[PDB]
């Protein structure tokens, strides 16, 4: 459907803009704080959205595609994280690369659980 | 308003060792339904176009909890619906 | 030059195409037991950023809008960490811990390997 | 080919050096500098800044100095290197 392409296109554009600006303002010369922040916030917000969708089954598909598939799908990134991690590996800072992969993966999983829990606390 | 998806879940027919469950199809697009059953766990999946399912391999006189999850996408599902039934 | 309106358009157009591709890949590949569509999007995006990083290094004369539309935009819309996170969390609450660890391992180790393959593919074709 | 394209030493000290290059505006996020005997020490300088002070060198020893221009967090252009006798 054309509405689905428009809802995903608008969200992904806004999410990518936010991720880019976060990189310009936070990415440091040593560690990519902008990329990590984008993934951690996006990981938290998808936990919020998943719990909000289950509590709002009336929400049609275009809200789902614009918010999650679009915005959060554009806000987070796996390729940027992968290239940043490979660049750390070829530099020899293995402990640094392991910390970045651990903070990105285990951190995003925790933020998603926190995103699920914050909605389940404000509804009861 | 709408709480769980699917909205209704019922055992339409039973056998000492098996059950036939059915649920109301939701207006929205369901990628797949995930069905869990166990003693009050085993899980399997039917495509989103299905509204019935066979649960077999049960023990007679045992009370089971049947839960159906409606996945709108790979990353999430609506609120599940659960029922209890003793074979 | 970097913070310019043309770069926002280049990123938005790229991110829109990348998100459309990930959405289609999910509709055609995401299975009932394994999210093959999300994994395909992350694996392909991991390989393509290795290709792009190697191409950018060999073409320093390229203007900034090329890498912003391709990497920041397209590959940033094609891959996803949030969708991967929600899928993995849903595996954990189901109790399939071995499946969740395998999905995280295939996404992490798989993306890094495809990125290395992408770098080596272009650097091989440049000799 | 490489970014920076040119790399020269403007001033020297028995134990330190001041390298210099042509910094391109708004294109480099940060530079990564590596130096060691021909393990390797690293430090970074902002992308807007040219020149960098490399101190703590030993006299009469050859050092390989490499500059990496990171246009973003995920990649850098081909580096430029010089060898220098302190
Ligand atoms: F990250
Ligand atoms: F990736
Ligand atoms: F993935
Ligand atoms: F995430
Ligand atoms: Na993304």
CA B29 – CA A60 distance, rounded (Å): 10
Measuring CA to CA, which residue among C107, A33, C73, B79 is closest to residue D29?
A33
Expressed in Å, this structure's resolution amounts to 2.2
Q: Which chains touch A (3 or more CB pairs under 8 A)?
A: B, C, D
Instruction: Tell me whether B27 touches chain C (CB under 8 Å).
Output: no
- How many CB atoms sit inside 10 A of residue D65's CB? 20
Considering only the beta carbons, identify the residue of D29, D73, D75 that sits closest to A35.
D73
- Terminal-to-terminal C-alpha distance of chain B: 32
Q: Which residue of C has its CA nearest to A11?
A: C16
Query: To which H or E segment does residue D10 belong?
Result: strand D8-13
D75: which DSSP letter? Answer: -
Q: Do chains B and D touch (3 or more CB pairs under 8 A)?
A: no
Whole-number Å distance, alpha carbon C26 to ligand 3 midpoint, is 11
**Residues near B81 by Cβ (< 8 Å), separated by ≥ 6?**
B4, B5, B6, B7, B8, B9, B23, B67, B68
CB contact under 8 A, D74 and C49: yes
Query: What are the backbone angles phi and psi of residue C55, rounded to the nearest 5°?
Result: -70, -40
Q: How many residues does chain C have?
A: 127
- Annotated ligand binding at C111? The verdict is yes
Q: Which chains touch B (3 or more CB pairs under 8 A)?
A: A, C
Measuring CA to CA, which residue among B3, B1, B5 is closest to residue B77?
B5
Which strands, in side-by-side order, build the sheet including D52-54? D8-13, D16-20, D52-54
The DSSP string of A21-87 is HHHHHHB-SSSBHHHHHHHHHHHHHHHHHHHHHHH-TTS-HHHHIIIIIIIIHHH--SHHHHHHHHH
Task: Give the gap in angstroms from C-alpha A38 to the nearest C-alpha of chain C.
Answer: 9
Q: How many residues does chain B have?
A: 87
Binding-site residues of A for fluoride sit at: 39, 100, 104, 108
B28: which DSSP letter? Answer: S
Give Cα separations from B74 to A65, A77, A85, C29 (angstroms).
Answer: 12, 17, 26, 11
How were these coordinates obtained? X-ray
- Beta carbons of C22 and C41 less than 8 angstroms apart: yes
Measuring CA to CA, which residue among C83, C39, C81, B47 is closest to residue A64?
C83
Q: Which ligand is nearest to the CA of C115?
A: 2
The DSSP string of C81-121 is SHHHHHHHHHHHHHT-HHHHHHHHHHHHHHHHHHHHHHHHH
Whole-number Å distance, alpha carbon D77 to ligand 2 midpoint, is 21
CA B83 – CA B78 distance, rounded (Å): 16
The SS3 assignment for D54 reads strand
Breaks following residues of chain B (C-to-N distance > 2.5 Å)? 40
- How many CB atoms sit inside 10 A of residue A31's CB? 17
């Amino acid at each position: 459907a054309p509405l689905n392409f428009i809802a995903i296109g608008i969200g992904a554009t806004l999410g990518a803009w936010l991720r880019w600006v976060l990189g310009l303002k936070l990415n440091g010369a040593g560690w990519p704080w902008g990329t990590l922040t984008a993934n951690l916030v996006g990981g938290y917000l998808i936990g919020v959205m998943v719990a909000l969708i289950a509590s709002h089954p009336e929400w049609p598909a275009w809200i789902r595609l614009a918010a999650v598939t679009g915005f959060l799908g554009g806000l987070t990134t796996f390729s940027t994280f992968s290239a940043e991690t490979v660049d750390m590996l070829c530099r020899g800072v293995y402990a640094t690369a392991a910390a970045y992969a651990g903070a990105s993966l285990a951190g995003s999983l925790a933020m998603t659980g926190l995103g699920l829990a914050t909605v389940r606390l404000l509804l009861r | 308003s709408v709480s769980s998806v699917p909205t209704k879940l019922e055992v339409v027919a039973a056998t000492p060792t098996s059950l036939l469950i059915s649920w109301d199809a939701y207006y929205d697009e369901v990628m797949y339904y995930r069905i869990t059953y166990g003693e009050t766990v085993q899980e399997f999946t039917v495509p989103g176009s299905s509204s019935t399912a066979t649960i077999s391999g049960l023990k007679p006189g045992v009370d089971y909890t049947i839960t159906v999850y409606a996945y709108y996408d790979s990353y999430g599902h609506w609120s599940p619906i659960s029922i209890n039934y003793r074979t």
